[PDB]
Symmetry: C2
Subunit: 155 residues, 2 copies
Amino acid sequence: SQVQNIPYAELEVGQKAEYTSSIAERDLQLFAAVSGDRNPVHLDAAYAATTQFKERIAHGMLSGALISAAIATVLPGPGTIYLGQTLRFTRPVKLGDDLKVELEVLEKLPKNRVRMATRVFNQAGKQVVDGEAEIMAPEEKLSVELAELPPISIG
Amino acid sequence: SQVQNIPYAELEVGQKAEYTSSIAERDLQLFAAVSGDRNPVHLDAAYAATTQFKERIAHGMLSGALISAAIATVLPGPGTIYLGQTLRFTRPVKLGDDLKVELEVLEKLPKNRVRMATRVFNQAGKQVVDGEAEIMAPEEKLSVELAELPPISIG
C-alpha cells in the first residue's frame, strides 16, 4: 500500500492517531546496534536475570524512536519536518511489553508548525513516556510508498 | 570491554565527555528497522537523489539514540537512570556525516539528579542537535562488561 499524509490545512487540534509496537528481543538488539548502547541489561539474559528486573529491559530511548516513526509515517506522515522533541521517561519498558504511541494535535502555529502531544503506553495502560513534539507539517497532500528493507538476520 | 561509571559524587559541574559515530548506510537501515520509519529519503538512494538533499539523510531521532548511548555508557555511564530528554533538531544529518555527541554536566541537584547538556555536532563542527537530559546519576561506583552485539547481516 501507499501511505497518505495529513497536510497542515487538514490537521485539527484534538486529532489523534496511534502506532503500536511489540517489544521483542530483536528490538532490543536492533536499538543497541544502532545506538551503540550495549549495556548488558538490554542484551544479556543471564546478566539481566541477576538484576532487580529479573529479565532484559528496553532502552528508554526506544520510545523516542517509536514516537518519531509515528509522526513520520502516520500523523501528519510523509513530508513532516522534525523540529524538536521532549521526552519524560515515566516507567521502564520490559522485554515482552507492547507499546502504543498516542499522538494528539495540541496547537497549530505559524509557518505550518504543529505542537503534537506524544504519549506512550504499555499493554496495561500505564504511561511509560510523556512528551511533546514540535514539527513543520506538510504543506501539500502526499502519497508515498515506504521503502521495503532488505532482510535483516540476527542470530 | 570494561566500562567504569562516574557516580554522582564523582561528577563535577563543567565535566565533559564525548561519543562519536559515523553515519553509515547500515545505521539508516537499522534505525528504520527498529523504529518503523521507512520513509524513502532515509533508505532509497535513487529516490533521495531526486530530493533537495541529493543523497539519503539520517532520521532526526538517530541523534537521540546516540545521545542516549553516550549517557548510558560514557557519562555518567552504567547505573544511570534516564528521567528526561529535550532535543532541538537544528540541521539535517546526511549519509556519510561523522557525528560527535558532547555531554556536559550543567548542575548537580538533590537526590542524585543531574542536568546534562547534550549537543551533537557534524564533521564540519556545525551543531545538528541541541538539548538537555535530566538524569539520576548512579550512587555507587560500578564496573560493567558491555555485552556483545549478536551478528547482524543485512541483505
